[PDB]
Amino acid sequence: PLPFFPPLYLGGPEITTENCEREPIHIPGSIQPHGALLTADGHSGEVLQMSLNAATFLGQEPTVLRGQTLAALLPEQWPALQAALPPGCPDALQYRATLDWPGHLSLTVHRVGELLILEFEPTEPHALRNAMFALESAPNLRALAEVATQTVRELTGFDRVMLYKFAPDATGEVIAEARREGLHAFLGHRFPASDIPAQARALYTRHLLRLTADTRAAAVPLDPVLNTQTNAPTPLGGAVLRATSPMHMQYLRNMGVGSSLSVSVVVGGQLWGLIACHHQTPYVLPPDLRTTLEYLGRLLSLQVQVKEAHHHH
Ligand SMILES: */C=C/C1=C(C)C(=O)N/C1=C\C1=NC(=C\c2[nH]c(/C=C3\NC(=O)C(C=C)=C3C)c(C)c2CCC(=O)O)/C(CCC(=O)O)=C1C
Numbered sequence: 001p002l003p004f005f006p007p008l009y010l011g012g013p014e015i016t017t018e019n020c021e022r023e024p025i026h027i028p029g030s031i032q033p034h035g036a037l038l039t040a041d042g043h044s045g046e047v048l049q050m051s052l053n054a055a056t057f058l059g060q061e062p063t064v065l066r067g068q069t070l071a072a073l074l075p076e077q078w079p080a081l082q083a084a085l086p087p088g089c090p091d092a093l094q095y096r097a098t099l100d101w102p103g104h105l106s107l108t109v110h111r112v113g114e115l116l117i118l119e120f121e122p123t124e125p126h127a128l129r130n131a132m133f134a135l136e137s138a139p140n141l142r143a144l145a146e147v148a149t150q151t152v153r154e155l156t157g158f159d160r161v162m163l164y165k166f167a168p169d170a171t172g173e174v175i176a177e178a179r180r181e182g183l184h185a186f187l188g189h190r191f192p193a194s195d196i197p198a199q200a201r202a203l204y205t206r207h208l209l210r211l212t213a214d215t216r217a218a219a220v221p222l223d224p225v226l227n228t229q230t231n232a233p234t235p236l237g238g239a240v241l242r243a244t245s246p247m248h249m250q251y252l253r254n255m256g257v258g259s260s261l262s263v264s265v266v267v268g269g270q271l272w273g274l275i276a277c278h279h280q281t282p283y284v285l286p287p288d289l290r291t292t293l294e295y296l297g298r299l300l301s302l303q304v305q306v307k308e309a310h311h312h313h
Pocket of ligand 1: 016017019020021023025174186191194195196197200210211212243244245247248251260261262274276277
């Protein structure tokens with residue numbers, strides 16, 4: 001990725017089709033409204049930043065919340081959370097726990113350097129393990145691609161699931177499409193490299209899933225916008241509740257897409273393509289289904305690696 005522009009809240013340039021690759025998508029200082037986000041110190045547990053919609057999801061508000069520690073707010077999680085995410089642990093490692101404030105809320109924690117980042121969202125799978133050998137017994141790559149997208153579509157219920165594949169020069173192709181009936185096909189159509197730009201592809205090699213639950217949903221800011229640990233922007237690259245590039249949201253809206261989700265197909269640490277999903281209406285894929293998709297993305301990743309790197313016999 002080319003060196004990123006400062007974010008808008010630090011007086012950075014407006015994003016246009018000419019400057020694309022340098023939008024700092026990983027630091028929008030805001031999240032998507034269907035969840036809440038705290039950041040806490042990785043040693044003390046003191047909550048530092050807090051998305052200002054946190055009231056809606058946590059009972060007590062930013063007026064009486066950013067003081068006290070994680071030890072006091074999540075007393076039965078804090079110990080396990082620390083052991084799970086030790087200092088130096090990799091970015092994409094995450095602690096999960098379902099818990100009910102007065103119910104049922106999904107907690108996802110990960111650490112960046114010395115910051116713990118906590119995502120909260122409402123919540124309450126084997127139909128995968130069945131269509132498992134359909135993937136295994138697929139004759140070739142095209143057949144593996146169609147099985148993959150049909151399978152995702154059955155789990156998720158999404159209107160359109162595609163398998164997007166990157167050429168050496170970074171331009172993509174929709175090599176498989178499973179879709180609601182009546183839609184004009186993308187299957188076989190090719191798109192410029194800039195449609196998923198270098199910085200995004202890169203964020204997408206080490207953060208395998210990302211979504212826009214609602215394409216016409218205002219991002220809610222973190223307060224304060226900067227990490228008080230550092231006085232710099234907060235990395236949200238690994239926070240699924242991360243606010244999406246407003247530019248990409250426009251492109252989604254133009255396609256009539258209310259909800260978007262993609263998962264990365266990585267072959268040998270090098271981004272192979274994406275399972276890309278569209279849905280006509282705003283939709284929050286539940287955390288359990290997202291977990292099933294991350295898993296499917298890893299398996300599909302390895303199935304692609306053996307099937308494609310044996311298009312030799
Ligand atoms: C720099 C301006 C941009 C132009 C012009 C553009 O086309 N994209 C631009 C910026 C970004 N795109 C981002 C993500 C992204 N783009 C796509 C593209 C497609 N989706 C489709 O369905 C099809 C064809 C049928 C195409 C070509 C995808 C799949 C993704 C990411 C995955 C997803 O949202 O599903 C992006 C990053 C977004 C983010 O913040 O995560 C930017 C900045």
